[model samples]
Target: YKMLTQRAEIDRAFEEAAGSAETLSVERLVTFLQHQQREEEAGPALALSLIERYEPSETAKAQRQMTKDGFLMYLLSADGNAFSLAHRRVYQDMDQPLSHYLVSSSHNTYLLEDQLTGPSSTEAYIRALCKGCRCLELDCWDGPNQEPIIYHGYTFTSKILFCDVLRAIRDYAFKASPYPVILSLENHCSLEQQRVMARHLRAILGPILLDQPLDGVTTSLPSPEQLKGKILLKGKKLGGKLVPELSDMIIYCKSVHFGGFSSPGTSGQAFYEMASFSESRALRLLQESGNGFVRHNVSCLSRIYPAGWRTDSSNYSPVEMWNGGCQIVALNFQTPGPEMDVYLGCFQDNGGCGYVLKPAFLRDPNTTFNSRALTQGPWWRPERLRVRIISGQQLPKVNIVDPKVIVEIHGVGRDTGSRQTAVITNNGFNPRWDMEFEFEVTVPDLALVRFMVEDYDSSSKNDFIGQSTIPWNSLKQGYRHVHLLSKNGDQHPSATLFVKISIQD
Candidate 1:
């Protein structure tokens, strides 16, 4: 680490390169310096090295001045190019984190409909995927053949072999380096598929699954020993650090991630987000609820951000996601601009790394394959499944269907007076699972609804609008996105937003 920290040294370099025309800014220079500091784990040495790097050529010398001007440009206005090649050169080095969750059976794609959607769609995916993403979140539903398919819900339209998805992953690239991606699988009503998905993903990616058992008496579960290093098997909520049933498994498993909590009605209560973090309410429940197993690893459910807080909403803002006591921030992929930067900056600022930016199509690379088609309609619900309200301001009190049909809601409309607006909110706590809803609308005058708009839950864990549902009218209300916490309870009630419309007086 270079210890030349005098303002004169930095300013001197800036002066030498001053007035030189270059795209990179001085702020970019400073930020680049900052990144170097973190990377070298030394600030002084890093700064000196940058000064030296800038001095090599007069044009390169001009880079230092360009940086100085950029810095001035920033303080002068709200819009200054804070990012530059200098910044990217170092900033891009760290593995960027990427995440993924359930969208439609076939609806899952990169960035666009999925977290992976983008222009040059595939190219965008390559660039957007953060190398820092250590945890790869996934929801697995039993497929038509009772095989472990990497998706949520039973009525999936487009189904790819789990192995195929992994193969695609093997090919995806970043200009930077490739880092290990952790596969966090939620067996949404399909414990049978757990082993299969685990085995296949392990074999293909050479990566591990979240498989550590919570401490205490373990329930008879899939053997954790068999999964050692190969994958991390998650233990259901156990009391403390360990469970007796998981005793044998714990010795060999990797890390203990927790799951399994829900409410018993159309509207249910639950933890803050789904199952990715451990909430205080849950801690109290496990401690005093007479459950014997105590030791457990906690992972809050994989979907959510409150309504209006998503990246796409006009109301979308980063402050919406502070101090939730969450370790992971999950959401579907519609997020863009400052919203994402805010979350990432916050995550690292507070003694933490950052979030996993999983898009829908991380697993599918072929242009011919469309994961979105399978996800556009109704899906199947299994016992202990997560439900997402497609498009609605308020969901009707859902009742079990005779054949137990999975509700598929679409293009729901609600009347909100002359400037009528339609809204849709995700009622499911776990956005990582396949989504299904029933679309129903009631209005005196349909003409009130002039234009239709769609918004998406950019975060991977909540309800989204864009490709998920359409809103009519202009009120611009209803949940653009939402997340379901672990099964609902008294504290965390389940939400059913109506896909509403704007009405004409």
Candidate 2:
């Protein structure tokens, strides 16, 4: 009954046909109605609908680019107060097309040797590329005969010179933008370069410190010059003998540590106890001593820690370090000990920005740092989005209409005719615009039933109901039909014809 009623719009003849049938089987009518409902929903078929299917390479690449381009546009439109993120040199030219900088190696000095000289040359450049970062991190090595240069590590030939890095930073400051870089240097060598780097950095970057004393003691930290706010430093395994230096540093320097810490085959209690106690003392001493403010980070401070600790002693995570005013966390993979909850919590909690998870790989397939996990409950929220063109091999336009291009819908009008679509996606840092396309139906075996448009090409056609800015939509509305008069793929535009159809009585 419902099917027959809805189909009455096709023509009054359908109503006349139904009224003439006195033996209207209610059961048959009900089944027919249900079938019509399912079909009329006009959604993408089970196979052609939205899904997480594996897409081929070419389609995936195109979808990725469209998303990147779209996100860049969104970022440009965002308000300044909205916090953002930057981890590489893309900051150098945020307005440029982002296609060139997707791979970190492209801007990685160690990875790309040719562009190895400027701020854009180092990972530190990530700060400049993104407008939201408040700190800068640099990995250090022995540079040019023992100077500390900001580099992750050394290659077979040479190390990045600290002087060159500092120069770029200095230039970056002079050339003001939304954010000025704050440097955080990690040492891969001993104390030889600590004082040297400190002396030069004190002049520009402000005060400096080594969690242990400059004397190579892993415990006695150094003091910061009164001229600058204290700079935190690293010296793992600094023994207690360095206490005097640690006290001195606290008096005028910054925070000090016990030693380079590692995860016990399974526990982080030792690390937390030392850090918590150290933090308590640093706060009181720095406040009473009237020295500059101090901030420090700890290792093994993550959500996923060794399982044994839960049944035994409760440990402090890196964020807990924040409870005492610590603004950062330094992670080392060798002693990986963090609770699973803590791991997910940091990324899930939108209130706090995430800690950078760096790994010292002793082996391969080391994806220690890969896709970040950002969650909002069941939804694993991605700061970066990913979109893909799943299927329907799109043949390029043969007709250049006012809308730019047009394509034929395959298998669209027979009993088995199907409406096919191409999906475009956005999988980057921001929201993107809906993609638009113009589709024309001219092959006579079928008639233009009904179709829709969307951000991506899909089946149900619900997703496609958007205004197409291209001329393809305009021509279709004006002429009503499109056909392939011939298959032509060459220097000239393919010629086509359009006409209206009416069944002859």
Candidate 3:
């Protein structure tokens, strides 16, 4: 039922997969289709039927073939095409509690690079949205000319107009995915400037701004389905009370100051309160009283962020927060490392639209997830993954440093498998790494293998060149071409890696 109707979409999928319009091998297609079935846990008929429907040798004669050699014709259509349902909706049900979905969020989304000195730009929003990031952060402060500006307050970060940010959200919020957009407002503006911001948001966002309850009642938070293509503003109310002028606009998500561990007051429960904490503080709270926090998260929204000491903008493990039932585990999107790789991998399922359903136990208000017990149980099966780092073609280069490639395997466990190849001197365009790496994974479904090529620098920190993350089950066995994608998920044309993968129970 899901097929590519446009050439651009088909080309984009192929580019993301093989980095070019190269021929897709029939063996790889069969393995990929079989893996896709296993990933979906669907029946075998669908995969076989697709193979019969597409492959010309199995179906009809090849419509168009290229004879690059004698007795060999490259098939260009059918089974050779990339399997892409990226644009399709991920989930069907959206009437559940708001905490049921793992919403994709970003911290300091306006900053392109560093937290302190980076320049804030609206392009960040566009890029984030295009990658299916549903939640965005905006730190608003009073600016010159009676307008409000968005920037990291008290830092050297350059600022942009709040009106311009709202305009960007209005134009591109639904450009990639039509899911809801939560504007996390860290407000530090005067009453006058606050009103100006409200007016700008209202005018720019117009109908898409979620100003009030859709059903005219607040029994609970609305589902993501109910908020499609809509934007919701979440900010701390002035003086622990809603401003009388802007009360109507702050109806849905009226961000409240967090009072940890204790049950929120009756009024606090009615008006949604967003409790945010640094990773350490949140971990301490959860470690001290995890069940109480989980119960709180079942009904209320909890947001956990990285600690302030990470000046390099690294990310913490999100699985702990997700295990505790926290919905928005905010990450620094600008940082590309193992943590971000897992973040992308977690969202790769459920159509990679950035909303993944939490486990049934986490969604149940009557139950609690014991992270310690869950990690020790025999509920998972161990897996042995063997990956051979074969060779590279047209690998990208960085200034003053030669490129070295590392193959890393990341999963829920602490012990990740990685092997680094020797740095190629002066020649990064073509590097061959005929090495083998193996990993023992406890949770195969949550595992991801990443191919990272970095500029090796001895004097300073190494710079990132490009990388790609593929799910464990989706990996095809035997020799195949793996494409390298940049941190922004853009493919590096002509940059390819050859590898052989084998997985066993």
Candidate 4:
């Protein structure tokens, strides 16, 4: 009854927010469940079960049972909503250490486009949060009328009101997921203006704002489960003179300086020390620590942001930081490319709730994980991954160019394997790519396979039609159907890829 009630509430919330038209379709719901069960055909049985359980009405069951789609039809009007207002039940295990999870994060989250001259708005926050981004960055400064604003400090990017951004966060924080939200506050405001910023956060967030320690004891931080639906402030600690009021507010994650590998900053701080390092500095610290940085992360939180030189808003491969148990590997969310694809692939596991528990080895201080050392040995073995590109349906057509499909697999050690199918001229609706492509992967668990359908154009660069990237582990064995989604991660209503998957060790 409790489970049913909670699910009912979740259904109601999503239905009211997204409306019926945008809800997941019966086909998509089947695909989701099939992937979850790692089975080729789970639709009929699972659909019937869900319908009978959620909809007790005999009319609904009778109407949905003998349909043309068989038992794989929606019984409830509010069925097929993707996200939930509650945190994923699997991720609610509070026994795991705080450092034992990869948190989905965003960098320069305000800008819609490039880093240098883009317009900043609060919509970026909404988009990212909707996509299950738990950690957000705000570069706040004193704006007009004594109100705080957020934007790149020296860049030509337009600014957004800080209070407005807070309000947006407050409103939409739990709309997609009920996980805790961390605001990576980069403050450049005056002392008086800082007070104003704090006031706005308190007033806007109200009860959900975690202004003080929740557990009463400040010696250690609370688990992600404990901080569910809460908003935490993370920023640099004041150095010269401390504002007791402001200092007390940031009791959980206090951004601190990283002096060295043996820096006492994290050890000496009363609250959790937030050691943020630039990509280059982080690499240097990892080398300097003889790769002890991974163990250091077991005790403290570390955030690695992109270097300041990425003018086009490119992202670094977060796997390196993840190898070191770094929870927050902030990426430029607006930039859509291989990096973002990898980021998407990483969080696709553990139910796509934006948090994946780190490997047990990475979370233990007594253990050592040498990502480089593991790759150097001759014992490294490659396993064959076979993917049969059977056919594509409703493939996008662009201009006069016919479409061709490419199967690419991104694996560990920066291994990228691609196999191109023959172009079907003048056939953009349904292209048959009955081609079998094989790749060798040393690390299948960390591997990601992407399917990209592009319009073949010899005279110019091939145009992107649609693509889908998934963690290799999630790929179901035997015959399976995969949907092709756009760069923005939207699945076309009819676009799909039929394929067969086999693995050889």
Best by TM-score: 4
Against the true structure, candidate 1 reaches a TM-score of: 0.35
Candidate numbers sorted by lDDT from highest down: 4, 3, 1, 2
lDDT of 4 by residue, 141-224 (tens): 888889989999998998899999998889878776666888988888887778888888888889998886765545556777
Q: Which pairs clash inside model 3?
A: none
lDDT of 3 by residue, 50-149 (tens): 4444444532324221111100111122122111233234753666666677788888888878888888899888777777788899998999989999
* lDDT value for model 2: 0.26
Better of 1 and 4 by TM-score: 4
lDDT of 3 at 38: 28
Model 4 spans > 4 angstroms off: 1-94, 216-220, 238-242, 262-271, 284-290, 375-383, 398-401, 414-416
> Which lDDT tens digits does candidate 1 get at residues 1-505?
1221222323433454343544344454444434421222224444344444433345644544334433332212211111111322223212211112111100122333322122213322332333233334444556667565554234322334555555555454211223323344444535455556655655765534333433542422222122223333332433453333332222222333343433232242222222432233333333342111111111122322224322232212222122111223343323433333333333222112222222222212121211112222121111111123332212123321011112222211221222212222443221222233322333211111111122323454222221111112112221122211111111113222222111222
How many steric overlaps does candidate 1 have? 139
Estimated TM-score for each candidate: 0.35, 0.29, 0.75, 0.78
Off by over 4 Å in 1: 1-51, 56-131, 152-158, 168-182, 189-192, 207-320, 344-505
lDDT of all the models against the reference?
Answer: 0.29, 0.26, 0.67, 0.69
Model 2: ten consecutive residues of lowest lDDT: 97-106
| Candidate 2 regions with alpha-carbon error over 4 angstroms | 1-131, 150-154, 167-184, 207-237, 240-505
Per-residue lDDT over 1-505 for candidate 2, one digit per residue giving the tens place of the 0 to 100 score:
2431122222232232234442212332223223421222223232122111211233422342112222112212211001122221122322211111111111122211222222224434433322122234456665566677654343332345665665545544323222222244445544666555655554554423223223432322221121122233322333342323322222211223434322223422332222323334433433432111111222211111112322222333333222222333322111112321222223212212222222111011111211112112211221211111111112123211111122222211221123333333432111112233333332212111222223332443222211111111112111111211111111112221111111111
> Residue 226's C-alpha lDDT in candidate 4?
77
Instruction: Point out the higher-scoring one by lDDT: 2 or 3.
Output: 3
Which one wins by TM-score: 2 or 4? Answer: 4
